[PDB]
Amino acid sequence: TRTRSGSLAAGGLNWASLPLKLFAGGNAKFWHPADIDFTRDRADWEKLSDDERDYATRLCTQFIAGEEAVTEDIQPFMSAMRAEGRLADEMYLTQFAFEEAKHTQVFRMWLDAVGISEDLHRYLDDLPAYRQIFYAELPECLNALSADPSPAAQVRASVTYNHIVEGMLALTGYYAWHKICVERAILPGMQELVRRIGDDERRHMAWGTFTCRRHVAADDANWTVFETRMNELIPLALRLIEEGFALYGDQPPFDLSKDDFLQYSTDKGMRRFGTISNARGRPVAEIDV
Amino acid sequence: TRTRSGSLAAGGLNWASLPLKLFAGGNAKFWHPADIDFTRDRADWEKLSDDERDYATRLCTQFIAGEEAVTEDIQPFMSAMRAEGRLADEMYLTQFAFEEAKHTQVFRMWLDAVGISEDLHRYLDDLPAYRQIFYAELPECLNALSADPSPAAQVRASVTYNHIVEGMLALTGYYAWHKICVERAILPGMQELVRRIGDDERRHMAWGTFTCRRHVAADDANWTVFETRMNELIPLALRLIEEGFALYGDQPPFDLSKDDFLQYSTDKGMRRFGTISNARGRPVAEIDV
Ligand SMILES: CCCCCCCCCCCCCC(=O)O
Ligand SMILES: CCCCCCCCCCCCCC(=O)O
Ligand SMILES: [Fe+3]
Ligand SMILES: [Fe+3]
Ligand SMILES: [Mn+3]
Ligand SMILES: [Mn+3]
C-alpha cells in the first residue's frame, strides 16, 4: 500500500542507529552451519546413559521447536516496523528471522548427527507450560501486531519474545547445555552450536531491549505494559522449568540442580526490568535515531 | 495458532528439498557488504558527464527502491508457507528477505560512497510505470496472500515478484549496469555489488520457479493463473523500460539502445513461460519433496 521509500530519503540510512549497527554485526559475525564439526558427537552420545540421552533429547526438542516457533512468530514484528515507517528496524528483523531459521537448521543437523530420527512431539506432551508459552502465548501475542502495531502491542510482544522466550528461557537453556557438556568435555558440536547461537542471541536481545526502551522513553504508559506483561509471564516461564525437573524426580541426570536453575532463570528475568526502567524519563533522542 | 512443529517430524527435515538446498547455498555463498571496495568509485563517478551521472542515479534509484519494496513485500509469502505447513520454504524465505535487505544496504552504501545525499524520490516522479509496479501491483498482490494463501494466490504473487520484478526487470537492470561499467572499466564497487546481488538473485528466481512449477503440476488450473498474470504484467514491465528511455530522448548516455533493452527484457520474460510449462502433467513428486 506504498507511497515513499525510506532508502531514498535525504541523508540516506543512519548507519549509527542501533538496528543497523546490529545488522552490520550480524553480517560481520555470520557463521556457517557447515563449519561446525558434528562428526564427534555421536561417539560421545553413545557413551551416555539412557537417562542422560533422554534428558538431552528433551532439552533439544524444547530448543528446536522454540527456534522454529520464533522463526515463524517474529514475522508480525516486521509488519509493525513497516507500519511505524522504520526501515532500519525492518532490515534488522529480516536478519533476526534468518538467524532463527539457521538455529532451527543447526539443531536439526545435530539431531541427525546423533542418530535421532523419531517424531519428537512426545517429548513435549508432559510439558504443558512449554506448550502454553510456545504454542499459545508467543503466537497469539505476536500475531496481535498484524492488526495492532501500536507501541503497547510492540512492548507486549517484545516482552514475550525477547525478554522471556530469549532472555529468560533460551539463556537458561544455554546454561543447561553448559552444565551438560563443558566439565565432561563432551559433544563439541553441540557446544560450538550453542556458542554461535548465543552470539546471535546477544543481538536479538539487544534489539528487544532497544525496542522496549524507545517506547518506554516515548510514553511512560509503555512502562506499565512492560512491567505487567513481564510479571504475567515470569511465573509461567518458571513453571516450564519446574515441569521439566519434575519429570526426572527433581533429580535429572548431569547433576542438574532444580534450585540452581530456578535461581538462574529468575535472575535472568529480574535483571531485565532494570535495563528497561532506566529509559523512563529519558529523551527519546538519547535512546533512538 | 500452533499445534505441531515441523522440525520435530519423524525423519527430520529433507535436506534434498529445493528450498533447503537453496538455503544451504545462500549460507555457503554469503557475502559481506564490508568486503566490497567502494573507495574507487567516487573518482570514476566524478569523471562522468552530468548526463551520465543523471542516468546512473536514476537507475540506482529504481534499484534501491525496488530492493526495499521486495524486502517488505516478500513477507506475506512466509505467511502463506506457514499456512501450507511448509517449514523448509519458510526457512528459505527468511534468507530471501534478509538478502533483499542486504541488497538495499549495499546500494545505499554505494550511493553514500559516490556522494549522493539528496532525496531521490524525484527520480521516480516521471516513471509512472515504475510506481504502478512497485507501489501498487507488487504490494497489493503480495498482500493478498495474508488473507488468501491459496495456490492460485501464490502463483499470482510469484509471477509478480519472481518472474517479472526479478526475472524481467532486475535482470534487465543488471544488464544496464553491465553496459554502463564493463567496457569502460569503471565503478568497480558497483560492478562487484551487481555480481554478488546477481548471484543471490539466481536463488530467489530458482525458488519462484519451483513454487510455480509445484502448483502447476498439482493442478493445471494454476497454469491458467500463471499465464494470465504474466501476460498482464509483461506490457507494464516493458512500459517501465520505455518510459526510462523516453526521458533521455530515447538516446541515453552510455550508448544504451532502447530496442536492445526492450528485446532483452522481452526475451527474459518470454523465456519464463517454458520453464514453468514443462511442469504441466508431471507428477508433483518429480518436482517437489
Ligand atoms: C533446565 C533447563 C530448562 C530450559 C528451558 C528450555 C527451553 C528452550 C527455549 C528455546 C527458545 C529459543 C528462542 C530463540 O532462539 O530466540
Ligand atoms: C534500461 C534499464 C531499465 C531496467 C529497470 C530497472 C528497474 C530495477 C528493478 C529492481 C528490482 C529488484 C528486485 C529484487 O532484488 O529481487
Ligand atoms: Fe533469538
Ligand atoms: Fe530478489
Ligand atoms: Mn534462536
Ligand atoms: Mn534483490
Residue from A71, A99, A169 to probe ligand 1 pocket by mutation (most atoms less than 8 Å from CB): A169
Say if the Cβ atoms of B34 and A24 lie within 8 Å: yes
Single-letter code of the amino acid located at A1: T
Kindly report the number of other CB atoms within 10 A of residue A284's CB atom.
15
- Cα A287 to the chain's mean position, in Å? 22
The answer to whether B258 and B242 are in contact (CB under 8 A) is yes
Cell readout for A2 is 506504498
Say if the Cβ atoms of A68 and B79 lie within 8 Å: no
Cβ of residue A118 closer than 8 Å to a chain B Cβ: yes
This structure's resolution (Å) is: 1.9
Taking each helix axis from N to C end, the angle separating A258-277 and A188-218, rounded to the nearest 10 degrees, works out to 30
Where does ligand 1 bind, in terms of residues with CB under 6 Å?
A 62-63, 66-67, 70, 100, 103, 165-166, 169-170, 172-173, 176, 201, 204, 241, 244, 261
CA distances, B200 to each of B52, B100, B166, B204, B259 (Å): 28, 9, 11, 7, 28
Say if the Cβ atoms of B9 and A98 lie within 8 Å: no
**Binding-site residues of B for Mn(2+), please?**
67, 100, 103
Ordered by start, the domain boundaries in chain A are: 1-289
Cβ of residue A71 closer than 8 Å to a chain B Cβ: yes
Write down the H helix ranges in chain B.
18-28, 41-47, 50-73, 75-83, 87-113, 122-125, 128-131, 138-147, 151-158, 171-181, 188-218, 221-246, 258-277, 284-287
Cell readout for B40 is 574507487
Cα–Cα distance measured from residue B220 to residue B84, given in angstroms and rounded to the nearest whole number? 19
State the ligand closest to the CA atom of A169: 1
Going by C-beta distance under 8 Å and a sequence separation of 6 or more, which residues neighbour residue A121? B4, B5, B8
Is B167's C-beta closer than 6 angstroms to any atom of ligand 2?
Answer: no
Give me the residue label for grid cell 528511455: B245
- How big is the CA angle at B62 (ends B57 and B67), to the nearest 5 degrees? 120
Cβ of residue A80 closer than 8 Å to a chain B Cβ: no
Say if the Cβ atoms of B82 and A68 lie within 8 Å: no
141-160 in chain B: CB under 8 A from chain A: 143, 146
Q: Work out the burial of residue B263: count CB atoms within 10 Å of its CB; fewer than 13 is exposed, 13-18 middle, 19 or more buried.
A: exposed
CA distances, B153 to each of A211, B50, B80 (Å): 34, 44, 9
The approach used to solve this structure was X-ray
- Determine whether domain A1-289 maps to CATH 1.10.620.20: yes
Cα–Cα distance measured from residue B123 to residue A6, given in angstroms and rounded to the nearest whole number? 14
User: B118 CA to middle of ligand 5, Å?
Assistant: 39
Q: Which residues of A touch B7 (CB under 8 A)?
A: 64-65, 67-68, 104, 107-108
Residue from B169, B239, B250, B267 to probe ligand 2 pocket by mutation (most atoms less than 8 Å from CB): B169
Q: With CA atoms as reference, report the closest residue to A103 among A18, A51, A40, A166.
A: A166
